[PDB]
Design a protein around this ligand. Sequence first.
Ligand SMILES: *[C@@H]1O[C@H](CO)[C@@H](O[C@@H]2O[C@H](CO)[C@@H](O[C@@H]3O[C@H](CO)[C@@H](O)[C@H](O)[C@@H]3O)[C@H](O)[C@H]2NC(C)=O)[C@H](O)[C@H]1NC(C)=O
Ligand SMILES: *[C@@H]1O[C@H](CO)[C@@H](O[C@@H]2O[C@H](CO)[C@@H](O[C@@H]3O[C@H](CO)[C@@H](O)[C@H](O)[C@@H]3O)[C@H](O)[C@H]2NC(C)=O)[C@H](O)[C@H]1NC(C)=O
Ligand SMILES: *[C@@H]1O[C@H](CO)[C@@H](O[C@@H]2O[C@H](CO)[C@@H](O[C@@H]3O[C@H](CO)[C@@H](O)[C@H](O)[C@@H]3O)[C@H](O)[C@H]2NC(C)=O)[C@H](O)[C@H]1NC(C)=O
Ligand SMILES: *[C@@H]1O[C@H](CO)[C@@H](O[C@@H]2O[C@H](CO)[C@@H](O[C@@H]3O[C@H](CO)[C@@H](O)[C@H](O)[C@@H]3O)[C@H](O)[C@H]2NC(C)=O)[C@H](O)[C@H]1NC(C)=O
Ligand SMILES: *[C@@H]1O[C@H](CO)[C@@H](O[C@@H]2O[C@H](CO)[C@@H](O[C@@H]3O[C@H](CO)[C@@H](O)[C@H](O)[C@@H]3O)[C@H](O)[C@H]2NC(C)=O)[C@H](O)[C@H]1NC(C)=O
Lengths: 346, 346, 346, 346, 346
Amino acid sequence: PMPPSEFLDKLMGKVSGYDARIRPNFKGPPVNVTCNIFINSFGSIAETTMDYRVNIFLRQQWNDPRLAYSEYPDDSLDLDPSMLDSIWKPDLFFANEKGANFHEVTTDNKLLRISKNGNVLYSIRITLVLACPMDLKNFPMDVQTCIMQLESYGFTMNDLIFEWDEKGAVQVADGLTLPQFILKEEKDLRYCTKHYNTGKFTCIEARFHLERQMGYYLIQMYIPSLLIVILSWVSFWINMDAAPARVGLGITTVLTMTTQSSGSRASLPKVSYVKAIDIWMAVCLLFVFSALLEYAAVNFIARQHVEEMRKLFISRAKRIDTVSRVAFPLVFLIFNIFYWITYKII
Amino acid sequence: PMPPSEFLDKLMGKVSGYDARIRPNFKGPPVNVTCNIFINSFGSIAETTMDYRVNIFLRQQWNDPRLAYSEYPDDSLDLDPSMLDSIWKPDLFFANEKGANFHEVTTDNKLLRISKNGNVLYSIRITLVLACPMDLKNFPMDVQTCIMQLESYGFTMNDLIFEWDEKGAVQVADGLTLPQFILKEEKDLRYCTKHYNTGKFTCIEARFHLERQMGYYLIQMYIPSLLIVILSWVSFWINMDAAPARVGLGITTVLTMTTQSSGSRASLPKVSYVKAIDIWMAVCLLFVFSALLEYAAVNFIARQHVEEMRKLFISRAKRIDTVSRVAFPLVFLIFNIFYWITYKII
Amino acid sequence: PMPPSEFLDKLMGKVSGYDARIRPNFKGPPVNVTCNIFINSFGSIAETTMDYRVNIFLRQQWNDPRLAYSEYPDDSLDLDPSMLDSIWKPDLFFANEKGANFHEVTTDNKLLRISKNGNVLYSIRITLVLACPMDLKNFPMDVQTCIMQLESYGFTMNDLIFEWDEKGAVQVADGLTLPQFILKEEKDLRYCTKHYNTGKFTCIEARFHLERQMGYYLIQMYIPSLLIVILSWVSFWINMDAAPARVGLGITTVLTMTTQSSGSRASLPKVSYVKAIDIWMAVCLLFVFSALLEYAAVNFIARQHVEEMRKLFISRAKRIDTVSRVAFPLVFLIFNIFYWITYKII
Amino acid sequence: PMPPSEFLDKLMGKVSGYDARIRPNFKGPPVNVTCNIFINSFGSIAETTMDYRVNIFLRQQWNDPRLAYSEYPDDSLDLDPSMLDSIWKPDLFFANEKGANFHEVTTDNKLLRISKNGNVLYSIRITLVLACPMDLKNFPMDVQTCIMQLESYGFTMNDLIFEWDEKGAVQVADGLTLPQFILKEEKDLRYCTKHYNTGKFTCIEARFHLERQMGYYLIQMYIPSLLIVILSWVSFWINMDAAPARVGLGITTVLTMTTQSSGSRASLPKVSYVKAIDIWMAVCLLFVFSALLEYAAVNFIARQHVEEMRKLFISRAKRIDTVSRVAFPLVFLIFNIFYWITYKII
Amino acid sequence: PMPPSEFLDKLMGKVSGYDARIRPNFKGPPVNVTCNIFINSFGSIAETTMDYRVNIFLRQQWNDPRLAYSEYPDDSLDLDPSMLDSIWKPDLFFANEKGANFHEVTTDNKLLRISKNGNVLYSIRITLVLACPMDLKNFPMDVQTCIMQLESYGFTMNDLIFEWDEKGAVQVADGLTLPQFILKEEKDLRYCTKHYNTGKFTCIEARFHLERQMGYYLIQMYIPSLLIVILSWVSFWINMDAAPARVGLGITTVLTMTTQSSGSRASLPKVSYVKAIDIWMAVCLLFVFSALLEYAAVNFIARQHVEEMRKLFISRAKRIDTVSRVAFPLVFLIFNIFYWITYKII
Ligand SMILES: *[C@@H]1O[C@H](CO)[C@@H](O[C@@H]2O[C@H](CO)[C@@H](O[C@@H]3O[C@H](CO)[C@@H](O)[C@H](O)[C@@H]3O)[C@H](O)[C@H]2NC(C)=O)[C@H](O)[C@H]1NC(C)=O
Ligand SMILES: *[C@@H]1O[C@H](CO)[C@@H](O[C@@H]2O[C@H](CO)[C@@H](O[C@@H]3O[C@H](CO)[C@@H](O)[C@H](O)[C@@H]3O)[C@H](O)[C@H]2NC(C)=O)[C@H](O)[C@H]1NC(C)=O
Ligand SMILES: *[C@@H]1O[C@H](CO)[C@@H](O[C@@H]2O[C@H](CO)[C@@H](O[C@@H]3O[C@H](CO)[C@@H](O)[C@H](O)[C@@H]3O)[C@H](O)[C@H]2NC(C)=O)[C@H](O)[C@H]1NC(C)=O
Ligand SMILES: *[C@@H]1O[C@H](CO)[C@@H](O[C@@H]2O[C@H](CO)[C@@H](O[C@@H]3O[C@H](CO)[C@@H](O)[C@H](O)[C@@H]3O)[C@H](O)[C@H]2NC(C)=O)[C@H](O)[C@H]1NC(C)=O
Ligand SMILES: *[C@@H]1O[C@H](CO)[C@@H](O[C@@H]2O[C@H](CO)[C@@H](O[C@@H]3O[C@H](CO)[C@@H](O)[C@H](O)[C@@H]3O)[C@H](O)[C@H]2NC(C)=O)[C@H](O)[C@H]1NC(C)=O
C-alpha cells in the first residue's frame, strides 16, 4: 500500500475540495470542540504585576467528516507537526494572555492524530503568563482564585462551542510543587459566556484555589514583630531613676518597628484597603508607643514632687509600674486571640 | 452552491481586478474609517519610565464597494485570519507605541467579516505600552490624564480619515479593576490633527482620567510621618536636667525622619519641581528640628545661671517649656488644615 | 563524478519516494535514537525563580535505511545546515524548557553527516533555562539535584525510543567552572517513562549533583553572626552600676541582629519549612536577648536592696555575674557542636 | 486609465530592466541622499548602562531616474508599505544601535511616494537605544552631548553620500518634555567621516545638548546634606560637662552622613574620577568629623585640670567654644561660595 | 555592457553549476579563511552573571575560484545584502555566545564584495554577550582576561581552517572608552584547537586584558573604611570615668562597620575564596572590635580597686591608655604597608 503521508494527500490536497478555511459541518450545527489541559509547570506567582506563569498542554478534540477515511487498515495516523496549516483548527485564545509564546526546540511541539470516524486530536505546549485580581483583604490568610478563560475570536456561538470533557478535564502533574502556595485538588468548572457589541462567543474556564503557606510569614514578620514588643515590656522592670536607660529604650524600639512596617509591604501591590498584616504592625506599634508614654507619665510625677503629700506621689509613680507589668502582658494576649480567630473563619 | 471560501475567490483572486494595494473609492472621496476600542486588561502603570501597559480590541469599520457581493443568500461571511494579506487595510498606528506585539496563541487573533453593502469589520488584539507626561505637582492628589492617539502614516487627510462611532466609542470591561488607580466613566473624545513637513494626517484620541487611591499613601507615608513628630513633642514633658534623655531624642528622631524623606521618592521620577509629598516631609522635618533647637535654648539658659537675678532664669527656662507643650500641638494643626484644603480644591 | 550536493538530490528529491514526514522503518520496529549532550556553559543558578541556564550540544544518532548510499567512495558526507527540512528528525523536546532559543550567528549551528550504513548524526546548540524543585531543608549544606528530561511529543513508545550511549553519555567541558556550586563527576542515568491520557512516551534524563561552596556563607553570615553574640558577652565584664552602658548594649545589638535575620533571606524563595540558616540566627537571637534579660535580673535585685539581709542581695546580684561569664561562653559552644555535626552527616 | 498599482508594475516589474540590487546613476556620480529626522518620544536616559531610548521618523530622499514617470497626470503616487523590497533603498545604519526594532502595529510603518522627476521619499519609524560617553566631571551641573551618527555599510563615498537638508534638518515635537533633562533649541550639524581598513564611508550626525534640572538634586542631596552639618554645630551651645550628650551627637551624625555619601552614588556608573557631588559630601564629612575632634580637644583639657594655673585651663577650654560658634558657621559659608561659583562658569 | 547584478547571475544562477552548499576547492585543500574584528562599542561588564556585551564587525576573507570573473573591467563588485543565501559562507560561531542577534535597521548590515582573483570579503555587525571566568582573588587590583573564540561547527580541520591576518588582526575604535575598566593596547593571539568525540575543529581567539580603575573603590570603600577606625581611636583621648561616652562609641562604630562589610559584596558573585576587599574590612573590623575590648580592660581594673595597693591599679588602668594612643596608630600603619605592597606586585 501507500504510506499515510501519501494517503492523506488525497484528503488534504487539491482533490476532494478540502479547504483549511472552512469549518466542519458548514450550514449546519456548530463544531463542538472539547478541551482539556495538563499543567506541567506552575509557580512564579508575583504580586507587583499580579500575574503568574503557567505551562500547560492544550488538548483539542473535534469532529471533521471530511477527514473520515475508510480505506486505511489502522485506527490512528500520526501527522508531522509541519503540516498544521492544511487542516482547519479552532481559533482558541485566552482573554488574559498578556504575552505568550510557543516552544520550537528542534521541533514544533504539536500533536496531531486523526481517527477513522473523524476524531482529530490537537495538543500543543503553550507558555502563558495569566493575570488575576489579587484579593488581599487578609494577606497572610487569603485563598486566591486565579482562573483562565478560553474564548473564541472569529466564530460566534452558532459556529463554534467549547466544552469540557468528563474524563479529567484538568489534570495535575505528579510532582508539581509550588514554592509559596499550594494547589488544591478541587477545581471548579463553569462557563464564562461573554457578550460584546459584535455578538456572543463561547467561553470555558477553570478555577484554581491557591492557598498560602503561613510557615514563611510566621517566622519573618511575626516572630520579630512580637519580640520588639517584649523589649518595651522590660522597661517596667527597670528603676524609674535611670533616665538614659528607659528613654533610649522607648525610642530605639519604636523607630525600628516602623522599619518592620515599611518592610512588610516592600514587594506588595499598592492597594488602598487595609490588609491583615497592616493591622498587626499598627497595633504592635501602639504597644511600643504606649510604653514611651508610660515612662512620660511616671517621670512627670517624679519631677513634680510639703513633705507628707509628696510621699504619695512617689507611691503613685510606682503603683502604675506594678500594673504595667501585668496590663500589657495581658492586653496584648487579648489582641493575640481575636486576631488568630477572626481570620481563621472568614 | 459554493462555500464562502470559493465564493470570495472571485472577489479576492486575479479576476475582477481586485488589488490589496489600492484603497477603496480611488480618485474620489477619502475612506471614512470608524474605530472603537475595548479595554480588556489595564494597569501596571509605572512612574520611573512613565508608561502603562494596555490590552485593547481595535475594531475597524469602513466601506469597500469592490467586496459588495450580491449573490450569496447570507448577510455575514466570516473569514480565516490567514487571509488578511489579500484585502486593503487602513495603515493605523499609534504615536506612543514604544514597543508592541500581537497575540498568535494557536491562531492570529483577527476578526474579519464582510457585509452585503460592503461593510468590513476588522478587529484585532494589540498589547500596547503607552506613554504620557506625568504631572506630579500634587503627587498624592493628582488626576492623571493618559491619552492614546491613532494616526495615519501612509495616507494624508484627503485619502484616509479616522472617526469615532456614536454607539460606544470606548467600552470598558465588566470586571476591570486597577491596583492603584481608578478608571472614571467619563472619557473625552477630541481630534489630534497633526501637521508635519510632508503634510497633514488624521488623528483620533480618547482621554482617560486616572485618579489615585489615597488609602495606600495615607497609611505608609502619612501615619508614620506624623507619629515621629509626636516623639519630638514628648521631650517637653521631660525634666530639663536629664541631658542624655532629651539629646538622644532630638537626634535619633531628626535623623530617622530623613529616611522617610529619602524613602518617599525611591520609585519616583527625578522631577525638578516640588510635589505635595515633598512639602509634607520638609515641614515635618522643621518640627523635629525645632524641638532640637528648643532644648538648645532651654539648656543654654540653665548653664548660664548674683542670687536674685539667677532665680528668674530658671523660671524663664521653664516658661518656654509651658508654651512648647501648647504651641507645637497647635501650630502643626494649623499646617494640617491648610494642607488638606488647598490640595482638595485644585 | 558529481558533488555530494547533487549526489544526495537523488536521495532527498522527488525521486526514490523519500518524504520527510515518514519515520524510518515504518510498519516495523520503532526508531532507536541514541543521544548524548555536551555541556559548554553552566551556572547562573538563581533561587527566586528556581531555574538555571545551560548551554549544551544535543547530539542525535539514529538509522535511516532510505539514506544508505552505496555509490559514493567516501564514508562521511557533510550537509549544509540549511537543508534540515528535507529529512526526518526526531521530535525531541524537554519537559522543563520554560523558554528557549537557538543560535543563528552567521550560520544555523547544526551538524548533519550521513554514513554509508545509514547512520545520521544530528548535533545542534540549544540554550535552555531548566527548572528543578529546590530542596532547602539545609540551605548552606544541601546537595541539589537538578535533572533534565528528554521526552517525545508526537510519537509514542512503539514509534520512537530514546536511549543513552555507553561511550560518554554526558561529557563535561575542560574548563567549566561555576561561581557558587560545583559539578560532581558522578551523573546518574535513569529512565523517566511518563503516562498520560493519550498514551505512553519515551523519556531519558541525567542527574546533576550541585554541591554548594560554604566558603561564601561562612564569611558573610557566619562570622558577623558570631561576633554580635560576643558583644552581648562583654556586658558581664562591666560594672552593674552604669545603667546607660549595659542598657544601650543590650538593645543596639539585639536590634542589629534582626537585620542579619532579615538579611539572610533577601534573595531566597518564600518557603514554608525552616532551613539551616534560620536556626542559626534564631538561636543566636536568644543569646543576644538573654543578655538583655540577664541585666534585667541583676538590676532588679540592686533596686530592691534591714542592714544585714540587704548585704546578701548585692552578693547575689554579683554571683550571677560570675556565672554568666562562664555559662554563655560554654553554652553557645555546645550549640556550636551539635550544629556542625548534625548537618554534616545527613 | 489604470490605477497606480498597475501603472508602476511597468516600472517595478520584469520589463524596463529595473532591479532593486542596482543603485541609481550607476557608472557615474554617487547617490546624494538627504535625510531629516523627527524626534517623537525622548527620555529614559539611564546612567548605569550609559544609553538613552529615542523614537524618530527617519526620512530619506534621493533621485532615481528609473522611476521618473511621465504619463500619469498626478504628481505624487503613494505606495503600499508591503512593496519596499522592489526598489533600491540606501543601506543606512547607526554606529551606536545596541539593539533596535521596527513597529508593525497593523501595518509596517513605512512611507513611500514617488515624484515625477524621480524624487523618492522614504520615511520609517525606528526605536533606537543610543549610547554616549557620559562626562561626569561635574555631575549636578554638566551639559551632556549625546550624538547619533548615520553611516553606510555597503557603499563607500564614491557610491553613496549622506547630507542634511537646509529646511529643518532636525525637528522637535510640539509637546516633547523630559523628566530629568531639557532639550536645547540649538543642535549642531557636522560630519563624521570614518576611515577603516576597507575604505572610507559617509557619515552624518547631529549634536543634542541635554542640560540637567538642578531642582531635583537640590532637594534630596543638598538640603539634607546641609542640615546634618547644623546638627554638629549645636554641640557648641551645650555645656562641656555633659559627656553622653556631645559624644552621642558627634557619632550618630558622623555615621549617618556616610549613608548620604553612599546614597549619592547608588545608581551612578563606577567612574574613576571625582565628580562635583563627591566633593560636597567629603567636605561636609570633614565638618561633622571636626566637631567630633573639637569635643576631643575640649574634654582633653578639662580632664587634665596647683590651684592658680588650673583656672586658666577651664577658660581655655571655654575660649575655643566661643570661637567654634563663629568659625564653622563662617568657614562652611566660604566653601559654600567657592562651590556655587566655580561650577557655574566652566 | 550589462550591470553587475545581471553579470553575476551567470556565476550565481542555475548555469555554471554553482551551488551554495559546496565549499570551495572540494576534494582538495581546506578553505583558509582569515578573519579580523573591529570593536565598535565595549563595556557593560557585569559581575553577577559574569558576562560582557560587545559589538564588533566580523570581517571574513577566503578564496572561491568559482566566482573568479575575468570579463568585467572593474576590480571590486559590491553586492546587495539580500543575496547572501546564494554563495557559500563559513559556518563561524562563538563558543560563548549566550544569546546574540544581528542588526536590521533599514538594511541587513552585511558587506559583500568579490575581487577578480576570487577574494570575497564578508563583513557583518554582531552584538555578542560574551562570558569569562572572573578571577577575583584580588578584587580591587586584578587584571581580568576575557577572551572570545571563533570555532567551527559543521566542518572539521581538513575542510575549514580559521587564521588571523597580520595587518591589524584586532582593531580598536578611536574614541572607545570604558566606564570602569581600561583596554590595553597589547592583545595576544593564540589558537584554541578543541577535540570532541566527533573530531577536531579549528578555533581562533584573542586575549583582552581589562585592568580596573582604582579611583572608584578608593573613595567609596577605602576612605570611609579608614575613618571609622579613627572613630575608635578617639576613645583613648576620653576620660575613663564617663561610661556612656566610651560604651556607645565602641558599639555604634563596630556595628556600622559590618554594614560596610555587607555593603562591599552587594553586587558581587558568591565566590568561595577570599578576595582583597574581604581582608581589608575584616582586619579593620578587628581594630573597631579591639577598641571595645580595650575599654573592657580599663573599666575592669577601675571597678576592682587596702589603700596603697589600689593606687597602682589606677595608674595601671591609665598606663594602657598611654600606649593605646600610640600602638593602634602605629599597628594599623604596618598593615597599611603590607597591603599596598603585596597586591601591587602579584
Ligand atoms: C453540538 O452540541 C449541541 C448541543 O449543545 C447539539 O445540539 C442540539 O442538537 C439537537 C439534535 O441532535 C437539537 O434538537 C433537539 O433534539 C432533542 C432530542 O435529542 C429534542 O428533544 C429537542 O426538542 C430538539 O429538537 C437541539 O436543538 C440542539 N441544541 C442546540 C442548543 O443547538 C449539536 O447537535 C452538536 N453538534 C454536533 C455536530 O454534534
Ligand atoms: C467621508 O466623510 C466626508 C465628510 O467628512 C464626506 O464629505 C463631504 O461629502 C459631501 C458630499 O456627500 C461634500 O459636499 C457637500 O454636500 C453638502 C450636502 O450634503 C452641501 O451642503 C455642501 O455644500 C457640499 O457640496 C462635502 O464637501 C464633503 N466634505 C468634505 C470635508 O470632504 C465624504 O463624502 C465621506 N465619504 C464617503 C465615501 O462616505
Ligand atoms: C530497537 O530496540 C528494541 C529493543 O529495545 C529492539 O527490539 C527487540 O528486537 C527483537 C528482535 O531483534 C525482538 O525479538 C526478540 O528477539 C530475541 C533475540 O534477540 C528473542 O530472545 C526474544 O524472545 C524476542 O523474540 C524483541 O521483541 C524486541 N523488543 C522490544 C521491546 O521491542 C528493536 O529491534 C530495535 N530496532 C532496531 C531498528 O534496531
Ligand atoms: C552629488 O553631489 C556631488 C557634490 O558633493 C556632485 O558632484 C560635483 O559635481 C560636479 C558636476 O556637477 C563636478 O564637477 C565640477 O563642476 C563645477 C561646476 O559646477 C566646476 O567648477 C568644477 O571644477 C568641477 O568640474 C564635481 O567634481 C563634483 N564633486 C564631487 C566632490 O564629486 C554630484 O554631481 C552630485 N550628484 C548628483 C546625481 O546630483
Ligand atoms: C591552506 O593552508 C595550508 C597550510 O595551513 C596549506 O597547506 C600546505 O600546502 C602545501 C602545498 O602548498 C602542502 O605541501 C607542502 O609543501 C611544502 C612546500 O611549500 C613542502 O616543503 C612540504 O614538504 C609539503 O610537501 C602542505 O602539506 C600543506 N600543509 C597542511 C598542514 O595542509 C594549503 O595549501 C592552503 N590552502 C590554500 C587553498 O591555499
